[PDB]
Amino acid sequence: ADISLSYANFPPAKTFPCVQMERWKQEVEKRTAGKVQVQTYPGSTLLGAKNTLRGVMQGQADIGCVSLAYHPGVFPLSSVFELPLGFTSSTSASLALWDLYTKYQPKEFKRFKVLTMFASAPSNIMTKVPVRNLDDLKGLEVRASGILSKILESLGATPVSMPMSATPEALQKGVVKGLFSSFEVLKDLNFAEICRYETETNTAVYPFAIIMNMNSWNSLPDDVKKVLNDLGREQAEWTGKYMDEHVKRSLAWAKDKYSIEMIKMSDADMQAIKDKTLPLIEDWKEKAAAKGVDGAAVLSDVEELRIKYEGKAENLYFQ
Numbered sequence: 113a114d115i116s117l118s119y120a121n122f123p124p125a126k127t128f129p130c131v132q133m134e135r136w137k138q139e140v141e142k143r144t145a146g147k148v149q150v151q152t153y154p155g156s157t158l159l160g161a162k163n164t165l166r167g168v169m170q171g172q173a174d175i176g177c178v179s180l181a182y183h184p185g186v187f188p189l190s191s192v193f194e195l196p197l198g199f200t201s202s203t204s205a206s207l208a209l210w211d212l213y214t215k216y217q218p219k220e221f222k223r224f225k226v227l228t229m230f231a232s233a234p235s236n237i238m239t240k241v242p243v244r245n246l247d248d249l250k251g252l253e254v255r256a257s258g259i260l261s262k263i264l265e266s267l268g269a270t271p272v273s274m275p276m277s278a279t280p281e282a283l284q285k286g287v288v289k290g291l292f293s294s295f296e297v298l299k300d301l302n303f304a305e306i307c308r309y310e311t312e313t314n315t316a317v318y319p320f321a322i323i324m325n326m327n328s329w330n331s332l333p334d335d336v337k338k339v340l341n342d343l344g345r346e347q348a349e350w351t352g353k354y355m356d357e358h359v360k361r362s363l364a365w366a367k368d369k370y371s372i373e374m375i376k377m378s379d380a381d382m383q384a385i386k387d388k389t390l391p392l393i394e395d396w397k398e399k400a401a402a403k404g405v406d407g408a409a410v411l412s413d414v415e416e417l418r419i420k421y422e423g424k425a426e427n428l429y430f431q
């Protein structure tokens with residue numbers, strides 16, 4: 113190759129942000145006929161959580177993976193995708209996020225080439241004892257942090273912060289009685305052994321951006337830029353599909369091994385959750401306004417994109 117790019121990624125190799133990174137590498141090397149090579153650095157071996165943004169800006173790495181939620185205030189527009197907005201899959205959230213970015217071109221990313229974006233699967237409640245309604249959450253100790261803790265507090269539950277590593281013992285001791293995370297942990301971290309009741313609240317996702325140093329981007333010939341540009345939407349879709357299938361495999365494994373049960377709360381309970389969490393949306397809108405973003409316009413557009421990628425309404429023909 114004549115062009116060599118380093119790709120920093122903070123989480124462990126086995127996790128979805130790194131898995132998609134490797135697939136992206138494969139497609140870039142193939143589609144450029146070997147003109148570009150990519151060296152990957154999973155698990156914070158080049159840049160980690162503390163220095164991916166600055167590190168990419170400085171060229172310490174050519175490319176890096178950012179979890180937007182870890183940098184409050186830095187992404188006033190794209191952070192909308194941290195909120196409880198009703199997304200029910202990684203695929204739909206990933207594609208909606210990419211579309212929103214492409215539409216708005218927010219200045220929060222002006223220092224970088226944004227190579228792709230994607231989102232986690234939605235956060236759900238996984239517990240030792242079934243949570244079938246909101247009364248079941250009252251006073252319930254659940255491992256959570258950030259916005260998910262805020263949501264639990266608003267629902268009358270008891271969010272507890274603690275390291276993922278300490279959570280198994282904590283669960284067994286009753287220090288927490290479940291966790292608020294995406295379903296892949298049921299298999300990947302064997303949480304299904306302990307938490308065999310999974311309540312699908314589809315609460316929120318975590319959005320990510322793959323960013324590239326502008327000098328590095330500038331250096332690429334036009335044919336290479338086209339390859340990377342074309343991969344933006346493709347990689348958003350690929351990552352979401354990978355993640356949704358990875359969740360599907362987690363759940364099937366857990367059902368086969370421990371007979372886990374999938375639970376949905378009533379429509380009335382789901383509306384109560386919305387009503388109780390509306391302040392988080394209002395907070396975000398004030399934050400957006402303070403940085404010159406039209407928060408209501410963005411939220412409207414997000415729902416339009418959600419329906420585009422998920423819509424459950426029946427065909428007009430049958431209405």
Ligand SMILES: [Cl-]
Pocket residue numbers: 117118151
């Ligand atoms: Cl390198």
